Scaffold this active site. Structure first.
Site, mmCIF file in Angstrom:
data_model
loop_
_atom_site.group_PDB
_atom_site.id
_atom_site.type_symbol
_atom_site.label_atom_id
_atom_site.label_comp_id
_atom_site.label_asym_id
_atom_site.label_seq_id
_atom_site.Cartn_x
_atom_site.Cartn_y
_atom_site.Cartn_z
ATOM 1 N N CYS A 199 0.847 -1.181 0.000
ATOM 2 C CA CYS A 199 0.000 0.000 0.000
ATOM 3 C C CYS A 199 0.886 1.236 0.000
ATOM 4 O O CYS A 199 1.769 1.381 0.849
ATOM 5 C CB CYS A 199 -0.971 -0.021 1.184
ATOM 6 S SG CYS A 199 -0.237 -0.100 2.840
ATOM 7 N N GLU A 210 -1.863 -5.036 -2.676
ATOM 8 C CA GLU A 210 -2.826 -5.693 -1.804
ATOM 9 C C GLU A 210 -4.047 -6.173 -2.569
ATOM 10 O O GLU A 210 -4.468 -5.574 -3.560
ATOM 11 C CB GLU A 210 -3.289 -4.744 -0.708
ATOM 12 C CG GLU A 210 -2.270 -4.489 0.353
ATOM 13 C CD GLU A 210 -1.262 -3.445 -0.039
ATOM 14 O OE1 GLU A 210 -1.371 -2.852 -1.130
ATOM 15 O OE2 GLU A 210 -0.331 -3.223 0.754
#
Lengths: 100, 282, 32, 213
Positions: free
Chosen positions: B145, B179
């Protein structure tokens, strides 16, 4: 296995020091070249009073060319010193240990 | 009832307001105070008001202490090790989980890589991008992220920023992903990524090619290519994962790269294996 | 005291330059 | 916006030609671990300088009371909530004849062999305000008792806390080689003694001409 433990404590911070061997020396050489060419530039005043328009401020800017070299070496002392604290005390953590 | 608790409301830094969005495990008595100030470069922690100019003066190391790996005129590329630099990185991931709701800081944070994107200054280096990717080999997952401070968006930092993060990922050269579960403002930016990268990677056929001809320089798998083929509405190409062509392409914005596709960071950088793989058994 | 104070510039070139050659003295113990 | 942000910024750094890699864990990112509030210098303004002639300066605070501040961690795990379980200055003397309160003693030991104690911890990390910094045993026998007895009642009233809020969370061939290779940082320090001699013959020349002119 305690020496393996402290070896993986120490290799990552002895390893960034030959990178600092790449770093801190080229300015020592460049500032030394500036010092010798500048000394050739300010010899003539002491020569002509020997046989002041530039000499004193040129020695001051020689010092400006060299104090950063000195503080680079002093930070080199600092980053030698703290890891050398943990280094010699970890040599001592081996020696006082039953391993070494 | 935990991940949807906002406690801060305001940050002013410089000329720039920061609104929090998510829950981070900060002490709630510092959420009770109104001022949230911090060091611009080194991120020093306090709770008081008689310390500002003096920490400002005593911080003459006005940078992030990361290992700078690539600075052009525009970007400046650090990495930080959190086993090497801890508490700064404790708060660095605390800020990211203040802006993201899928991370909790009690289990270990030392090993995994802290890549960074700053602008250089003449005072130092202003932080304008960052992410906390793994040290190695999580779930594939060649990026993580990617989060940064929200007021330096929308002008030419963040999009091409995450694309050269991806470029470093396939220039650290392994197939991965971001992710899996959720994304709020970036999933559309993820397909903007994969469309722009795919068109720039395979307008270059001159023959017929399998998708593994180009998947080696993707860090996303061959099998992803059909779902990227149907993000852009229709590019069925006599389908089969073992061979593909491209049509005489419709070219909406292929040769329309005059905006936000202006700079190239060269693959001039080393490899960042773990020197100790660090099988932490404790 | 005054003339030696002006000419210590003229007299410590030997010290400053054997500092310059201390690295030439130490290169092989750096090879240890 | 801020009105302090523009007066925050002054000075510069080494704008690199190519690369100056940075590497500093949080113990060397700011400087001193703590800062000062209104009361530590309200004591200076009202209960120190009413008729005094000797100077009690800010660098004396953030080192001398820092000695007790760091010393009650290394010496006292006894009570982390105590108003009064710290004992006096004179029993803190073994932790005050030396103050390894973030590394002052080996800071002296390094420039023992660099023999440049006139460079009393010169750095670019912390600013130029360093010639004011003088060593801490004379700081003890000038101010340590009074900075202790002002700093003592504060940890009586911050009662085990501090001013900051709380933050919750094969032997063989492996010693002789690291000896014979950190002898290279030993002789890197010998180069440092060397360049200390370079700058001190430089300021020999400077201050020689300055005691001329």
């Amino acid at each position: 296995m305690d020496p393996s433990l402290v070896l993986e404590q120490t290799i990552q911070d002895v390893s960034n020091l030959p990178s600092e061997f790449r770093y801190l020396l080229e300015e020592i050489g460049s500032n030394d070249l500036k010092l010798i060419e500048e000394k050739k530039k300010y010899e003539q005043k002491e020569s002509q009073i020997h046989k002041d328009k530039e000499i004193k401020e040129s020695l001051l800017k020689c010092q400006s060319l060299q104090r950063e070299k000195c503080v680079l070496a002093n930070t080199a002392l600092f980053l030698i010193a703290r890891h050398l604290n943990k280094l010699e005390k970890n040599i001592a953590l081996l020696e006082e240990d039953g391993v070494l | 009832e935990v991940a949807r608790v906002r406690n801060l409301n305001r940050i002013i830094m410089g000329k720039y307001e920061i609104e929090p969005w998510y829950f981070s495990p900060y002490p709630i008595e510092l959420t009770d105070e109104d001022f949230i100030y911090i060091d611009d470069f080194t991120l020093q922690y306090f709770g008081s008001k008689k310390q500002y100019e003096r920490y400002r003066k005593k911080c003459t190391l006005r940078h992030p202490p990361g290992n700078e790996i690539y600075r052009d005129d525009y970007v400046s590329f650090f990495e930080i090790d959190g086993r090497k630099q801890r508490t700064w990185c404790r708060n660095l991931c605390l800020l990211s989980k203040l802006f993201l709701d899928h991370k909790t800081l009690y289990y270990d944070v030392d090993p995994f890589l802290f890549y960074c994107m700053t602008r250089r200054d003449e005072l130092g280096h202003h932080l304008v991008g960052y992410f906390s990717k793994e040290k190695e080999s999580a779930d594939g997952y060649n990026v993580a992220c990617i989060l940064t401070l929200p007021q330096y968006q929308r002008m030419g930092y963040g999009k091409l920023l995450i694309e050269f993060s991806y470029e470093l990922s396939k220039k650290e050269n392994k197939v991965g992903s971001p992710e899996k579960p959720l994304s709020d403002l970036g999933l559309l930016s993820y397909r903007a990524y994969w469309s722009d990268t795919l068109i720039t990677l395979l307008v270059e056929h001159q023959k017929e090619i399998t998708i593994d001809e180009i998947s080696s320089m993707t860090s996303m798998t061959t099998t992803d290519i059909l779902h990227t083929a149907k993000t852009l509405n229709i590019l069925r190409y006599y389908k089969g994962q073992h061979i593909i062509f491209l049509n005489e392409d419709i070219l909406d914005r292929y040769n329309r790269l005059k905006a936000k596709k202006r700079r190239t960071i060269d693959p001039n950088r080393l490899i960042w294996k773990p020197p100790v793989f660090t099988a932490s058994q404790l | 005291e005054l003339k030696k104070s002006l000419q210590d510039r003229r007299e410590q070139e030997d010290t400053f330059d054997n500092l310059q050659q201390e690295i030439y003295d130490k290169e092989t113990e750096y090879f240890s | 916006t801020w009105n302090e942000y523009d007066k925050f910024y002054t000075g510069s750094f080494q704008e690199t030609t190519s690369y100056i890699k940075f590497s500093a864990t949080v113990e060397d990112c700011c400087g001193t671990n703590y800062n000062m509030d209104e009361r530590d210098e309200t004591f200076l303004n009202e209960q120190v300088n009413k008729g005094s002639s000797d100077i009690l300066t800010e660098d004396e605070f953030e080192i001398l009371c820092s000695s007790f501040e760091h010393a009650i961690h290394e010496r006292q795990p006894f009570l982390s909530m105590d108003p009064e379980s710290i004992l006096s200055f004179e029993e803190l003397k073994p932790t005050l004849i030396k103050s390894d309160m973030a590394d002052f003693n080996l800071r002296n030991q390094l420039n023992h062999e660099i023999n440049s104690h006139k460079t009393h911890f010169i750095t670019q990390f912390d600013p130029v305000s360093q010639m004011n910094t003088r060593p801490l045993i004379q700081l003890i026998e000038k101010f340590g008792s009074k900075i202790y007895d002002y700093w003592r009642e504060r940890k009586i009233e911050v009662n085990g806390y501090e001013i900051f809020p709380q933050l919750k969370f094969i032997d063989i061939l492996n010693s002789q080689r690291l000896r014979a290779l950190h002898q290279e940082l030993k002789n890197a320090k010998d180069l440092a003694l060397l360049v200390a001699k370079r700058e001190n013959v430089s300021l020999n020349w400077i201050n020689d001409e300055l005691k001329i002119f």
